[PDB]
Design a protein around this nucleic acid. Structure first.
Ligand SMILES: [Mg+2]
Ligand SMILES: [Mg+2]
Lengths: 96, 80, 110, 154, 98, 126
RNA sequence: ACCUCGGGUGGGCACUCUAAGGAGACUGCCGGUGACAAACCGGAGGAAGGUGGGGAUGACGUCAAGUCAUCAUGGCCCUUACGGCCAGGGCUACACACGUGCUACAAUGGUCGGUACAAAGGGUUGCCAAGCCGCGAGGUGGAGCUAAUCCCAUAAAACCGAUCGUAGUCCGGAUCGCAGUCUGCAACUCGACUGCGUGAAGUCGGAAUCGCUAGUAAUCGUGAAUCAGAAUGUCACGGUG
């Protein structure tokens, strides 16, 4: 299982929404593993007509997060996907 | 430049206004705005009116002009 | 006369062949490879035998007394046709398409 | 100008077991080329052991103390007349004045085989005929013409 | 201008219109096993198309503003409309950092 | 057991240092110590906390170091082995706090700032 | 344990690493100093000691500072053209003067042959491997790949051996002749690189004048944005110090 979102106050708060709501149904799912983080810097110029040394630089992040089942016997999380997706979490399934 | 896989270059409308204009021989200059094309041994001795940018200038085609394009014989900038 | 020109002494062979004016540095590394002369020895330590084989190679590339003659006609062909590459080459401007407004001083002097 | 400046220390010379030589090695390094400058200082160290039978540290110990000066001028302007004042060189400062004079005259020695340039500098200053020793004593002579300005408008 | 966005709108149509023959005409030429007689008549079909079909004639301008310089392709915005739209929390996942 | 784990980081390096009783076995990344660090003074700097605590002959030393620079890995071992020597007791604690070996050197590289060219160098005006 | 000796494999959750959540530092404690009061100077412990280092954060205002050509708008003019459309040319012209920037002027170097260690980042309209043919830039070839997996991708300086003997040079590389490949409908004015040849000025640079207090100056590489193609600039990350 792999998860992609934009802020750690969603994506690392929806794993407990999956770890609790799958281990309850009997199957063993281990602890989630972090991945390296995408970081993209964007330095943009700020003045309309030119004055070059005034700048401003941003950064867009992307948090990744990987789950790991042990015994696949539950289609419970397959129906509870619209619940576990909330606003900006994308879940590609790797049911190991 | 223009590597030998893609060997020659000439323009299409220029070719029919020359190859047919060989069959009725040199009694007129050829007024053409194109400058991207070379000259060829199918064209030795003609009269071309190459576009300066604001007029056409005549060209006396010789046998030893073959590799160079038409752009080296029209002017651009004066500097008197 | 020695090999077309005079050749210095107390030097290695590839450095000594460089002054023949029509052979650079990569070309003189082939001539000692094709003939068999060791560059690691000096030109003093060589034999007066195999220099003809060095002189054979000079009779196969060019000679500076005629290299400068023929390269002038390459310039001279560009001038008398009145092409743009020979148009500025008559005057003294740069040729390859450098910048002219400033800094092109090695074709105009001080 | 609040007084701020603390002290950082470099003391490392394992292949010879020295301390003055490591600080001298930093005055030879250019742009962080330490391993290049390390073998030149040893390269001009063994030529002295090749030349003199004594341990060449003591040749270097003697060559410092005939380039190192005692007093020097200090152009403190009164604000309406440019004066110069001969001042006592602080004991901490007087090491680095010789080591900085020594290297700059080695570079204009004009020999071949660069470690031989610095080799001849450390041989002369155990005697006194070096250009660093001649540059030392000339500034010593500048102080006594300046000695009238020692305390008075100083 | 407004008349200048409009003339570079229809360039995007004419590139995406043909878009398949020019792949084939450049598939013929690029083969070393291709015959030059099959290449020379393939040269004829390129130059008799209208020249506003190549991607090099296309110019990616800003979609809301139209300014040519200062365009990014991880957005669709200009250099100076991107700032005003990001301070209002619109662009998701985008913050300042150090 | 007697295996002792030691880590140490300096200038973006990281060294796993294992320490156990042996006879002078100094091996790093399956290489000898004189072979690994080619022609530098830091061949002895890795021994400097070891010969200070008079244990140069009494241990096996197994070192695995990653990342960093050439002379930055040698500093990682020197910081790394001092943490491995103080797993025993605090008898050699005062012998190393006074020696200035235990503190990790915090001096890391600084980022390029806008307007400037280097971290602090700026172009010339007139 | 296994191995074919590659964490290759079974395996392990010790670790490094990754990223979440926490503790730690407050002049806290010791001494002196002050009105013993703010504070100050020393001291112990400690990974860190006196706002630990860096970054974002710039008050009331100034210069009718800059921008009507990013956009928005008051007014004023054009509306058979001061608006539209399409070819070629142009902004890259060129006795000169000023601003920043790169190489150099050599022996702490120059070549040749081996050999050692990085971070950070981009890639399913793309990366484009192995093999393969080319003096070389490359051409075939098509894998793997939607990314801690695959590719970009070989870090360079350092080290080791050799020659080079300080000569306008085995220094320097401008100019220029000739021959090639790549993108693009198209390299003439006007692209970038490759081969071969030629080899300049330059022997550390007046009056003057600027940058910097520590992982800093100085020096060596790498990547990204824009982008069919095209960086000595801009932004960004590390070595040695
Ligand atoms: Mg002051
Ligand atoms: Mg590009």
């Amino acid at each position: 299982i792999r998860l992609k979102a934009f802020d750690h106050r969603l994506i690392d708060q929806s794993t407990q929404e999956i770890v609790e709501t799958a281990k309850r149904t009997g199957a063993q799912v281990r602890g989630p593993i972090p991945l390296p983080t995408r970081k993209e810097r964007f330095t943009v110029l700020i003045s309309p007509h030119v004055n070059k040394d005034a700048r401003d630089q941003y950064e867009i992040r992307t948090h990744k997060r990987v789950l790991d089942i042990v015994q696949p016997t539950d289609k419970t999380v397959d129906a509870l996907m619209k619940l576990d997706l909330a606003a900006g979490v994308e879940v590609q399934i790797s049911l190991g | 430049p223009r590597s030998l896989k893609k060997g020659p270059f000439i323009d299409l409308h220029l070719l029919k206004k020359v190859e047919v204009a060989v069959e009725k021989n040199d009694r007129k200059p050829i007024k053409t705005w194109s400058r991207r094309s070379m000259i060829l041994p199918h064209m030795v001795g003609l009269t071309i009116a190459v576009h300066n940018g604001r007029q056409h200038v005549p060209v006396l085609v010789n046998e030893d002009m073959v590799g160079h394009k038409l752009g080296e014989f029209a002017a651009t900038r004066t500097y008197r | 006369r020695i090999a077309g020109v005079n050749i210095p002494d107390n030097k290695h062979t590839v450095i000594s062949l460089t002054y023949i004016y029509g052979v650079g540095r990569t070309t003189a590394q082939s001539i000692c490879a094709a003939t068999g002369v060791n560059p690691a020895a000096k030109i003093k330590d060589l034999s007066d035998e195999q220099i003809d084989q060095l002189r054979n190679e000079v009779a196969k590339i060019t000679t500076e007394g005629d290299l400068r003659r023929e390269i002038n006609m390459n310039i001279k062909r560009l001038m008398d046709l009145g092409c743009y590459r020979g148009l500025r080459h008559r005057r003294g401007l740069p040729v390859r398409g450098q910048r002219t407004k400033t800094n092109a001083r090695t074709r105009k002097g001080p | 100008r609040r007084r701020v400046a603390a002290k950082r220390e470099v003391l490392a010379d394992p292949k010879y077991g020295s301390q003055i030589l490591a600080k001298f090695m930093n005055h030879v390094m250019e742009s962080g080329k330490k391993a290049v400058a390390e073998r030149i200082v040893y390269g001009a160290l063994d030529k002295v052991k090749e030349r003199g039978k004594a341990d060449p540290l003591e040749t270097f110990e003697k060559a410092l103390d005939a380039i190192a000066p005692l007093v020097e001028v200090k152009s403190r302007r009164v604000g309406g007349a440019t004066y110069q004042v001969p001042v006592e060189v602080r004991p901490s400062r007087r090491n680095a004045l010789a080591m900085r004079w020594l290297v700059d005259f080695a570079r204009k020695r004009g020999e071949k085989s660069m470690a031989l340039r610095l080799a001849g500098e450390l041989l002369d200053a155990a005697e006194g005929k070096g250009a660093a020793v001649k540059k030392r004593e000339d500034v010593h002579r500048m102080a006594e013409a300046n000695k009238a300005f020692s305390h008075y408008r100083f | 201008k407004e008349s200048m966005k409009n003339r570079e709108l229809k360039r995007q149509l004419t590139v995406a219109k043909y878009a398949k023959k020019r792949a084939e005409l450049k598939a013929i030429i690029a083969n070393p096993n291709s015959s030059a007689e099959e290449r020379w008549n393939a040269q004829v079909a390129l130059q008799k198309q209208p020249r506003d079909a190549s991607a090099s004639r296309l110019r990616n301008r800003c979609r809301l503003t139209g300014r040519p310089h200062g365009f990014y392709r991880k957005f669709g915005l200009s250099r100076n409309k991107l700032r005003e739209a990001a301070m209002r929390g619109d662009v998701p996942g985008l913050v300042k950092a150090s | 057991a007697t295996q002792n784990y030691g880590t140490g980081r300096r200038k973006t390096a990281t060294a796993r240092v294992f320490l156990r009783p042996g006879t002078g076995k100094i091996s790093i990344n399956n290489r000898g110590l004189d072979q690994f660090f080619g022609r530098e003074t830091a061949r002895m700097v890795v021994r400097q906390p070891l010969e200070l605590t008079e244990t140069v002959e009494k241990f096996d030393i197994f070192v695995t170091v990653v990342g960093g620079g050439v002379s930055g890995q040698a500093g990682a071992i020197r910081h790394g082995i001092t943490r491995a020597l103080i797993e025993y007791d605090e008898t050699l604690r005062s012998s190393l706090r006074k020696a200035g070996y235990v503190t990790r050197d915090a001096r890391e590289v600084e980022r390029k700032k806008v307007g400037l060219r280097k971290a602090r160098k700026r172009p010339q005006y007139s």
